[PDB]
């Protein structure tokens, strides 16, 4: 089974104000951590059997242990095993090995001298895949996202609600959506939403770049994708986030480009994993891309990617929410009227609002002030907002 | 290259032998590190063609769907020349 390896996270300490309540909650966290440290330190200290078992098994197998590939199972205790050098050896299977675990192609621990099967290596996970697993959940939560109520609701119905409440889906008869593509202009909150869902989820989370799943050697790309998805299968409730799928999701086309055909083969293996022969199981996929129109139709089609969540440039209410969230830790003055920044049509995104807040803080620091003002925000708006050149036509239209 | 040499030697051992090389585009691809090994195989084949000369009973027929991919050195004069 090998249930999910959910990322560990400390409880959120709120209020975020530098008050005594935050001190008390943080000191409660420190208290419990010290309790855990004391118990885990005095556990092995007071430890006075299985040592005979270890002294027999380890002595019999000996060190070092070679790692080979099982090729054939001839007898109940004899196997043809190929070493990493590609040389096959007819070796013996020692008694202290589960015969049901031995399968062709499995990674098998052999003795160094006689290469006899001393055990089976379970994980044998590519290091480029085990690094995709998330161990420390990101600090961003659903409370750090301003607006985006529809997008958050869709992503929760897709990858969150089925885990907590599969009762609705089972009762009505729907198979819950198992693929979501977060597409929109950059800086709108796609990666932020991925961070938030990773923080909230109780299922294992795999983060991919859409470009680290691509390897030098000819066949290692699709093989790496298959390994990643198999690992996702192992920890049954899983979420596989592939940021910037544009890297491999680009539309298929015919050209010589010996590397591009491997690119397309890798993406073909990806879409086979998403929806092909054999079921995919209880593993959700979240994909993010700035440009969706350049993606291959067979990748973003329903059944492979069930939902296409659009992240538009924030509107007035959403922008006001972003400003309220990102100046929450600030010390605003009384003359500040955030509205003037929220209005007008600068086409500023959530990342733009974050930079506006940061630059207003820097402007206040320039005047040796730890509290921001309206003038600082106004200066920061023009200082940071200068991104696009023209983006507009002339006075043709009345 | 060993396979090509052994096949040609087996053709030599039998007096009336006909070699049939299908899909010459695979090993007859123009040169440009598996390219090195493919070149070794193709040049061994070329040497085998250059080997026999006294109108020996060993004759070879090559079939391909592509001629542009085929190495022009394969055609030459003392090698496969009957472009049927």
């Amino acid at each position: 089974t090998k249930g999910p390896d959910a990322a560990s996270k400390l409880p959120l300490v709120t209020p975020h104000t530098q008050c005594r309540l935050k001190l008390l909650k943080l000191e409660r966290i420190k208290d419990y951590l010290l309790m855990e440290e004391e118990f885990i330190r005095n556990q092995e200290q007071m430890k006075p059997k299985q040592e005979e078992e270890r002294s027999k098994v380890d002595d019999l197998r000996g060190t070092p242990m070679s790692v080979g590939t099982l090729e054939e199972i001839i007898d109940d205790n004899h196997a043809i095993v190929s070493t990493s050098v590609g040389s096959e050896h007819y070796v013996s299977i020692l008694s202290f090995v589960d015969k049901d675990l031995l399968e062709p192609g499995c990674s098998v621990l052999l003795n160094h001298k006689v290469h006899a099967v001393i055990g089976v290596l379970m994980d044998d996970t590519d290091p480029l895949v085990t690094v995709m697993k998330v161990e420390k959940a990101p600090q961003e939560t659903y409370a750090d996202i301003g607006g985006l109520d529809n997008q958050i609701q869709e992503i929760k119905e897709s990858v969150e609600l089925p885990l907590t409440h599969p009762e609705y889906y089972e009762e009505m008869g729907i198979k819950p959506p198992k693929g979501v593509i977060l597409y929109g202009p950059p800086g709108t909150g796609k990666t932020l939403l991925a961070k938030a869902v990773a923080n909230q989820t109780s299922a294992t989370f795999l983060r991919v770049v859409g470009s680290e799943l691509i390897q030098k050697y000819l066949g290692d790309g699709p093989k790496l994708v298959r390994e990643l998805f198999r690992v996702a299968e192992e920890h049954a409730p899983s979420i596989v986030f592939i940021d910037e799928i544009d890297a491999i999701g680009t539309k298929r086309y015919d050209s010589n480009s010996g590397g591009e055909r491997e690119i397309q083969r890798t993406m073909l293996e990806l879409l086979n994993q998403l929806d092909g022969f054999d079921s995919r199981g209880d593993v959700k996929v979240i994909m993010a891309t700035n440009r969706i129109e350049t993606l291959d139709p067979a990748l973003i089609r329903p059944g492979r990617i069930d939902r296409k969540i659009e992240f538009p440039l924030p509107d007035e209410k959403t922008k006001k929410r972003i400003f309220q969230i990102h100046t929450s830790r600030m010390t605003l003055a009384d003359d500040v009227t955030l509205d003037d920044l929220i209005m007008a049509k600068d086409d500023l995104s959530g990342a733009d609002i974050k930079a506006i807040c940061t630059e207003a803080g820097l402007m206040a620091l320039r005047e040796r002030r730890m509290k921001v003002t309206n003038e600082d925000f106004k200066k920061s708006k023009e200082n940071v907002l200068y991104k696009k050149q023209e983006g507009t036509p002339e006075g043709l239209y009345l | 290259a060993k396979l090509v040499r052994d096949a040609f030697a087996l053709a030599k051992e039998k007096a009336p032998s006909i070699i049939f090389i299908d899909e010459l585009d695979a090993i007859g691809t123009k040169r440009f590190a598996g390219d090195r090994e493919v070149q070794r195989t193709m040049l061994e084949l070329l040497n085998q063609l250059d080997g026999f000369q006294p109108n020996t009973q060993v004759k070879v027929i090559a079939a391909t769907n592509r001629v542009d991919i085929l190495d022009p050195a394969l055609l030459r004069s003392g090698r496969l020349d009957r472009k049927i």
Binding site: P186, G187, N290, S349, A351, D352, T358, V384, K387 | -
Partner: protein, 116 residues
């Protein structure tokens, strides 16, 4: 991350967004006082002769790059070297400016007169 590049408008607006790049610092061609500062900076080790007014040299360089100022100083030094001297004169600086400020026009009045 510090990223330096010309052609600000040709790099995609995906690394240009505020999250990836928080500050976009423009390096306009040096103004007159900036050109004076650059001239003073790059002539520190050059043995200048009294009557080497660098303000007038900055006037004679209407909107250079800043590397062109260093090239101007280098070419004045080259004229001094070719004359086998170690000092630099004002006329030397002005004519070095003229050489470094070599502009290539269309040289085809037919093309220039297309746009009336």
């Amino acid at each position: 991350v510090i990223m330096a590049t010309n052609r600000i408008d040709i790099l995609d607006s995906a690394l240009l967004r505020p999250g990836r790049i928080d500050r976009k610092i423009e390096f306009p061609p040096p103004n007159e006082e900036a050109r004076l500062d650059i001239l003073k900076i790059h002539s520190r080790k050059m043995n200048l002769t009294r009557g080497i007014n660098l303000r007038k040299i900055a006037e004679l360089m209407p909107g250079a790059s800043g590397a062109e100022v260093k090239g101007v100083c280098t070419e004045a030094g080259m004229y001094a070297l070719r004359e086998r001297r170690v000092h630099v004169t004002q006329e030397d600086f002005e004519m070095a400016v003229a050489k470094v400020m070599q502009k290539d026009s269309e040289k085809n009045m037919s093309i220039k007169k297309l746009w009336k």
